Enzyme design. Structure first.
Site, PDB file in Angstrom:
ATOM      1  CB  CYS A 102     -19.537 -52.601 -10.847  1.00  0.00           C
ATOM      2  SG  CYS A 102     -19.746 -54.366 -11.392  1.00  0.00           S
ATOM      3  CG  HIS A 134     -20.421 -50.233 -14.563  1.00  0.00           C
ATOM      4  ND1 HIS A 134     -19.526 -50.795 -13.675  1.00  0.00           N
ATOM      5  CD2 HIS A 134     -19.954 -50.519 -15.801  1.00  0.00           C
ATOM      6  CE1 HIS A 134     -18.564 -51.401 -14.348  1.00  0.00           C
ATOM      7  NE2 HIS A 134     -18.804 -51.253 -15.639  1.00  0.00           N
TER       8      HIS A 134
END
Ligand SMILES: CC(=O)c1ccccc1Sc1ccccc1C(=O)O
Lengths: 205, 213
Positions: free
Chosen positions: A130, A88
């Site tokens: 992400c 992430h």
């Protein structure tokens, strides 16, 4: 004269940092599908000729250390260095299991001033989330930034497919540009290449 | 090794395209910014390089932030159907993410946004080149390229910029036979080994860009 020199013993080290699971205090979801992404990246970059090592669910201190040690190894007989980060990430920062690490901080270990043995050689970072100057010869390829759980990242399949097909006859910016195209056309966001390279980069001599 | 040439950008258009140069030399005192000695000479070389390539070149001077925003917005609203690409060149003071008008700072992102896919239907699938010298369904962001004179940068009152001198040299020798990233890479090398500074290219092009045939 116009290519990075590739007449070296090995192509170089490839550290793949694969982050699927995250702590309580981070509060971010399991990235289902990276084990399909990372496994594909392992074959691509291995078939290219990198010494690939995959590291899973890394802390920030670990990523930092992992990279610091990498930078401290001897690369005299290597053509280049590759690091791949799957995680992430907010703007300008990546995610360990235990918090946030700035991407600037990971790369800084390899600047010309801190890793004499990679000087004048490509330092390539692939991120999906992400007498010589110190920032020369880095290239970044970001994907942005979306992961499929059963097939992987639109970005990874394109980069892998193109590398298996053209890894030996296309320059790095050609390969990446065709990745940019396949991600925009077939699967809506586009990747981004940041290049401080100073020569053409082919994965062959 | 070496290469020759549906992977290229379509070049079969009446015009190569517009090339907007913004040459900010003089700033209001309240900005605390100083005159950018050397930039006239940069803007001149650039105007000649880009005209020689095929661009309809226009040069603006000592622009305010509103002027800079307006001429870009209006350029994004013109009809580019008969142009292969578009180019804008910003010469000014700059800081992280921002560029200086004569009267203030304006975010570089707001200047380039006028040309996104959803806002400039007529440059869709066409490269949009931005060269920035700032001395410190289709994805809407596709087919942009940014060439900054430095990573997130000096100049010569008498010789001009480093970047520009290099860019312009390489464009004259090889602008009509090298791919854009090949050109920009060679500029990178020259700003590095010709003179403590390194330029930075951010590419989202989806094809190879040659300025010819
Ligand atoms: C984030 C980035 O790379 C960027 C750098 C400079 C200016 C704007 C940007 S954002 C961007 C990137 C590509 C195409 C269009 C835009 C836009 O929306 O104007």
């Amino acid at each position: 004269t116009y290519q990075y020199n590739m007449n070296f013993e090995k192509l170089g080290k490839c550290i793949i940092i694969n982050n699927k699971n995250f702590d309580k205090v981070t509060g971010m979801g399991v990235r289902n599908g990276t084990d399909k992404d990372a496994e594909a990246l392992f074959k691509c970059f291995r078939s290219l000729g990198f010494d690939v090592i995959v590291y899973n669910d890394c802390s920030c201190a670990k990523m930092q250390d992992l990279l610091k040690k990498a930078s401290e190894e001897d690369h005299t007989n290597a053509a280049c260095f590759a690091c791949i980060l799957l995680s992430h990430g907010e703007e300008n920062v990546i995610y360990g299991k235990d918090g946030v690490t700035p991407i600037k901080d990971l790369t800084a270990h390899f600047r010309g001033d801190r890793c004499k043995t990679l000087l004048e050689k490509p330092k390539l970072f692939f991120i999906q989330a992400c007498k010589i100057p110190v920032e020369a010869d880095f290239l970044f390829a970001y994907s942005t930034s979306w992961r499929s759980p059963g097939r992987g990242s639109w970005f990874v399949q394109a980069l892998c497919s193109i590398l298996e097909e053209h890894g030996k006859d296309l320059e790095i910016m050609q390969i990446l540009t065709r990745v940019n195209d396949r991600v925009a056309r077939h699967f809506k966001q586009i990747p981004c290449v940041v290049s401080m390279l100073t020569k053409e980069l082919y994965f062959s001599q």
